[PDB]
Amino acid sequence: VESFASMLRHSPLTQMGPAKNKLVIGQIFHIVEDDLYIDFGGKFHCVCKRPEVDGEKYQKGTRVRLRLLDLELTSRFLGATTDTTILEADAVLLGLQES
Amino acid sequence: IRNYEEHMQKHRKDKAHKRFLLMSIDQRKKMLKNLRETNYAVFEKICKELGI
Amino acid sequence: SNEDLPVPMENPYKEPLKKCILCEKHVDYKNVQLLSQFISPFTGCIYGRHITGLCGKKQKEITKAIKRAQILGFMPVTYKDPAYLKDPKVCNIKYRE
Amino acid sequence: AGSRLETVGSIFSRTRDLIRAGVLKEKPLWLDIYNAFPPLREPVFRRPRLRYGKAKAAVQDIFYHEDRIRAKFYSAYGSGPKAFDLFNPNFKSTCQRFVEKYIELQRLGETDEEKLFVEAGKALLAEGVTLRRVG
Amino acid sequence: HRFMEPYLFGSRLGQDIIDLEQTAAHLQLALNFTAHVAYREGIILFVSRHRQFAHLIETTARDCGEYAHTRYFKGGLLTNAPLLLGPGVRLPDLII
Amino acid sequence: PMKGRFPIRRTLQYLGQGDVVFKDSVKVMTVNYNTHGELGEGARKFVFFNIPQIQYK
Amino acid sequence: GKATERADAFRKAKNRAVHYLHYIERYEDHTIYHDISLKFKRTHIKMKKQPRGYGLHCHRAIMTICRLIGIKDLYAKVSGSVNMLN
RNA sequence: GCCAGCCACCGCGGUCAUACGAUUAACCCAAAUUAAUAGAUCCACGGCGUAAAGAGUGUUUAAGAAAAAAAAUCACAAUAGAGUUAAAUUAUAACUAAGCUGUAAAAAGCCCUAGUUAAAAUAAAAUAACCCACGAAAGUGACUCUAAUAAUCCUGACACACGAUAGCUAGGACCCAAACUGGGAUUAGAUACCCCACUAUGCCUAGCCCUAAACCCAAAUAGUUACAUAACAAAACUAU
Ligand code: FES
Numbered sequence: 129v130e131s132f133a134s135m136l137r138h139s140p141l142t143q144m145g146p147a148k149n150k151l152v153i154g155q156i157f158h159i160v161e162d163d164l165y166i167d168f169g170g171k172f173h174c175v176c177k178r179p180e181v182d183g184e185k186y187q188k189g190t191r192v193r194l195r196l197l198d199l200e201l202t203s204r205f206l207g208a209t210t211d212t213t214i215l216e217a218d219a220v221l222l223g224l225q226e227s
Numbered sequence: 228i229r230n231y232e233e234h235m236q237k238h239r240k241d242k243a244h245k246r247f248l249l250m251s252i253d254q255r256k257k258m259l260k261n262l263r264e265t266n267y268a269v270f271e272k273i274c275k276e277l278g279i
Numbered sequence: 280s281n282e283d284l285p286v287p288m289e290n291p292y293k294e295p296l297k298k299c300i301l302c303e304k305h306v307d308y309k310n311v312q313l314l315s316q317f318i319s320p321f322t323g324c325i326y327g328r329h330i331t332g333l334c335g336k337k338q339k340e341i342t343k344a345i346k347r348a349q350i351l352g353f354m355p356v357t358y359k360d361p362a363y364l365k366d367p368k369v370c371n372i373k374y375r376e
Numbered sequence: 377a378g379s380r381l382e383t384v385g386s387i388f389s390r391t392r393d394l395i396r397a398g399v400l401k402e403k404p405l406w407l408d409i410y411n412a413f414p415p416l417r418e419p420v421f422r423r424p425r426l427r428y429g430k431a432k433a434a435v436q437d438i439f440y441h442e443d444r445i446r447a448k449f450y451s452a453y454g455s456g457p458k459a460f461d462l463f464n465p466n467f468k469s470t471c472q473r474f475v476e477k478y479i480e481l482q483r484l485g486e487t488d489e490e491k492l493f494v495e496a497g498k499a500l501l502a503e504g505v506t507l508r509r510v511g
Numbered sequence: 512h513r514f515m516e517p518y519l520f521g522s523r524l525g526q527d528i529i530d531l532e533q534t535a536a537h538l539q540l541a542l543n544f545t546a547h548v549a550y551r552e553g554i555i556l557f558v559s560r561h562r563q564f565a566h567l568i569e570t571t572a573r574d575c576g577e578y579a580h581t582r583y584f585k586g587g588l589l590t591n592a593p594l595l596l597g598p599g600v601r602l603p604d605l606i607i
Numbered sequence: 608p609m610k611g612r613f614p615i616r617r618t619l620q621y622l623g624q625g626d627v628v629f630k631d632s633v634k635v636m637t638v639n640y641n642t643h644g645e646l647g648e649g650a651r652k653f654v655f656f657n658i659p660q661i662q663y664k
Numbered sequence: 665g666k667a668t669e670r671a672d673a674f675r676k677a678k679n680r681a682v683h684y685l686h687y688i689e690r691y692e693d694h695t696i697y698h699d700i701s702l703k704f705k706r707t708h709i710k711m712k713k714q715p716r717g718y719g720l721h722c723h724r725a726i727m728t729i730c731r732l733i734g735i736k737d738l739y740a741k742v743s744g745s746v747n748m749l750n
Numbered sequence: 751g752c753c754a755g756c757c758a759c760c761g762c763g764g765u766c767a768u769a770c771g772a773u774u775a776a777c778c779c780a781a782a783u784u785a786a787u788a789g790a791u792c793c794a795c796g797g798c799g800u801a802a803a804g805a806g807u808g809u810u811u812a813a814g815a816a817a818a819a820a821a822a823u824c825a826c827a828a829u830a831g832a833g834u835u836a837a838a839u840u841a842u843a844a845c846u847a848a849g850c851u852g853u854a855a856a857a858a859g860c861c862c863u864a865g866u867u868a869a870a871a872u873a874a875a876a877u878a879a880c881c882c883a884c885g886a887a888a889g890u891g892a893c894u895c896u897a898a899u900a901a902u903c904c905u906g907a908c909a910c911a912c913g914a915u916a917g918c919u920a921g922g923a924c925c926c927a928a929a930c931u932g933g934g935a936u937u938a939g940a941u942a943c944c945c946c947a948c949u950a951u952g953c954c955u956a957g958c959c960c961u962a963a964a965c966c967c968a969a970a971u972a973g974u975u976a977c978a979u980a981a982c983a984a985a986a987c988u989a990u
Pocket residue numbers: 297298299300301302303333334335336337
C-alpha cells in the first residue's frame with residue numbers, strides 16, 4: 129500500500145510547479161459553434177475560440193496544446209466574505225497536437 | 228531642559244516647545260523623587276552638582 | 280518515519296517585487312529633463328500615481344523636486360519646456376484620439 | 377409528529393429522545409443502522425463565525441526539497457520543451473528528470489550548487505534532451 | 512470554508528488539497544450506510560443542482576431503480592409534502 | 608460579587624474560614640514583597656489571598 | 665399562531681406546536697440536573713435546583729411550562745425584560 | 751344623558767352605561783370594614799455608538815495597579831522665527847470701441863467704463879492629492895534656511911500648560927470676500943431667498959476672551975476570536 133503523501137510528490141500536478149506559462153496538452157470534450165471546451169487535466173475546464181486556420185478539424189476528442197496562465201480564475205471583491213469563483217480556467221491555443 | 232530653555236528665550240510665543248519644557252521638568256521631578264527613595268547618597272550628589 | 284511529508288519552508292517561487300521606473304535612482308531639481316517628463320505639455324499640471332506609475336516614495340520626491348525648480352528658476356510653471364518636448368514618453372495618458 | 381428544530385442537535389439525538397419520551401411509537405428504519413454504524417462526527421449545527429484578530433488558519437503549505445530545485449530550473453530554462461501531460465499517472469516531466477538526476481548527482485558528495493546545476497545540465501545534454509537557456 | 516480546515520491535507524500554491532485518507536474513511540461508511548438503507552427497502556433520492564451532470568445523474572438513478580431530483584427545488588417540497596405531492600406520501604429515507 | 612479577579616474571596620465564608628489567631632502579645636505585622644521575579648510568587652499570593660483572612664480574625 | 669380570528673388563532677397554534685418539540689432531561693423526574701444561568705437577548709433568567717419538598721416557586725409563565733414538561737421542583741428568577749416570547 | 755357624578759393607575763358619562771345614583775343578585779373580609787397620613791420594603795457588583803452617561807486635550811501631585819511575555823522612534827502637510835514668489839486680481843498708463851455689469855426673466859448700478867498691452871502692494875496657497883504623513887488636541891499640505899517634536903517605553907484631578915471660529919482693547923495693512931445698512935426685483939406683506947454698492951471683520955504685531963455637532967457622538971493601558979447575533983450602526987469580549 130502506497131501512502132497518500134508519496135502520491136502527491138510524484139504526481140504530475142506537483143511537478144508542474146506554478147501554473148503560469150506552462151505548456152499543457154488537453155482534450156476537447158464539448159463543441160459549440162465558436163467555443164471549444166477543453167479539459168487539460170486540471171480541476172476545471174478552459175474555454176477557447178476556434179482559430180480561423182484549420183478550424184474544421186477541431187472536433188470532439190481532439191488533442192490540442194495549451195498555455196496555462198491561471199489554474200482557476202478567482203478574485204476577491206470588497207464586501208465579499210468568500211471569493212466568487214468562475215468555475216473555469218484560463219488558457220490559450222497554440223495549435224493542434226502534433227501526432 | 229537647558230536646550231529647551233534657550234529655545235524658549237528666543238521664541239517666546241512658541242507653545243509646542245513650552246509644553247515640552249514643562250513635561251521635561253515634570254519627568255525629571257518624578258525621577259528625582261524615585262531616586263531619592265532608593266539611593267539617597269547618589270541623589271544628594273546629583274542634586275548638588277546639577278544645581279537642581 | 281515518513282519522509283514524504285512537506286517541510287515548513289518559505290515559498291521558493293516568490294517572483295521579485297516590481298520596481299518602479301525611478302527605483303534606486305537619485306532624483307534632482309537640477310535635471311529639468313527628468314522632471315519635465317511627468318508634466319502635461321499643454322497645461323503644466325503634475326500627473327498622479329495612476330498616470331505616472333511611480334511608487335509611493337519617488338512620487339513625493341518628484342513633486343517636491345519639481346516645485347523647488349519652479350521657484351528657484353529652472354523650469355517653466357504654466358507649460359512644459361519646449362526644448363524637452365521630444366523626450367521619450369513615460370506616462371500612460373493619451374490626448375490624441 | 378416530530379421535531380423540526382435544526383439547531384437543537386443532530387438527527388440521531390432528537391429521534392432517540394422522542395422515542396424515549398413516548399411520542400414517536402414507530403421506530404424509523406434508519407435508526408437501527410445509525411446505532412450499528414455511527415459516523416466519525418455527529419452532525420451538530422454550528423454557526424460559521426468569521427475569524428477576527430491574530431488567529432490564522434492551521435493549513436500548512438505543501439512544499440518539498442524538490443520544489444526548491446524546480447524553481448532554479450524554471451527560473452533559468454523556463455518551461456521545458458516537452459509538453460506536460462496530466463492524463464498519465466506515471467508521467468515523467470523534463471523538470472522531474474532534472475530533479476531526479478540532481479538528487480543522484482548530489483549523492484556523490486558535491487555541495488556547491490553551481491557545480492550541481494552545471495553538471496546536471498551537461499548530463500541531460502548527454503541524453504539528447506534540449507535545454508535552450510532563456511536569455 | 513472554515514469548517515473544511517480539518518479535512519484539508521494542505522495548500523499547494525494557493526490550491527487546497529483534500530486529504531484522501533480521511534476521504535476513504537468517510538466514503539467507506541457512506542457506501543456502507545447507503546447499502547444498508549437500500550437493503551431494508553428504503554427510498555433514496557439523488558439531489559444535485561448542477562447544470563453539467565444533471566442528465567448523467569438522472570440516468571444513474573434510473574439504472575439503480577431509485578429516484579433523482581436534479582431540477583429546480585420547490586420551496587415546500589420536503590416540508591409541506593402533503594400539499595405538493597399528494598394526500599399520503601412516504602418521505603424518502605435517505606438523500607444523496 | 609461580579610467585579611474583581613476572584614470574587615469568591617470577598618464573601619463572608621472565605622473571610623471566616625481562615626484560622627490564624629495571633630497571641631495577645633502580637634500588635635504589628637509588617638509584610639514586604641516584590642512585584643517582579645519568580646521568587647516572590649509565594650509572598651504575592653500570600654498578600655492576595657491570606658491577608659484578608661488574617662486581618663478578619 | 666396568528667390569524668384574523670381568535671378562534672382560528674388557537675387552532676393554528678396547537679397544530680404548529682407539536683412540530684416543534686424538545687426533550688428536557690429531568691434528574692429523578694422532579695428537578696433539573698444542575699443550576700442554569702442564561703441571558704437570552706435582553707432577558708436574564710436564573711434557575712436553581714431544589715429538593716422534593718419545596719417545588720414550583722417560579723414565574724407564573726414558567727410554572728405553566730414546568731407542569732407541562734414534568735418538572736415539579738424548581739426556583740426561577742427573571743431579570744430584565746419580561747417579554748413572554750423571549 | 752360629557753349633565754348630576756366616579757377612579758389607587760389605565761379610564762367611564764355626549765337618550766340601549768355590567769364604571770354615575772337606586773334596585774335584585776353575587777363576591778370578599780368580619781366585631782370589625784373602608785378611607786387618609788406616616789413606616790417596613792424598594793435604585794447600580796447595573797450602565798456610558800444611537801437612550802441620562804467617556805467630560806475639548808496633554809503632563810503631574812494625592813493615590814493605585816505591576817505579578818507570564820514583550821516593547822526608544824522615524825521618507826512625507828508638526829510647531830516658532832527669518833528670507834523669498836509663481837498663477838490670478840487691482841492702483842496706474844497707452845490704444846481701440848459705445849456701451850459695461852446682472853438674472854429663470856428684469857430693474858438698479860456704472861458710462862471716471864469695457865477689451866488688449868505694460869505693472870507694485872496686500873491677500874490667498876491650481877495639478878501633485880486615486881497619496882494618508884506630522885502634532886497631545888484644536889490643527890497643518892507654495893519655496894528656502896535656522897531652532898525642533900517629553901519619558902528605558904502603566905493609570906491619574908478641581909492643580910500647571912494649551913485650545914478652530916466668532917467677539918473685545920491698542921497700532922498697522924486693505925487686492926478681495928463680506929453680517930449690518932441703502933437701492934433694484936419678487937410677494938398679499940419679504941425689515942428673506944435673487945441682483946448692485948459699501949462698513950465691521952477675515953490679515954500682521956502685543957494682550958484678552960476659553961466657547962463648538964471641540965463628534966470618529968465609541969475614555970487610557972494590556973490583550974482574546976473563545977462564549978455569542980435585542981434592534982440600528984462602525985462584530986463580540988476580558989483584566990487594571
Ligand atoms: S520601487 Fe523602489 S524607489 Fe520606487
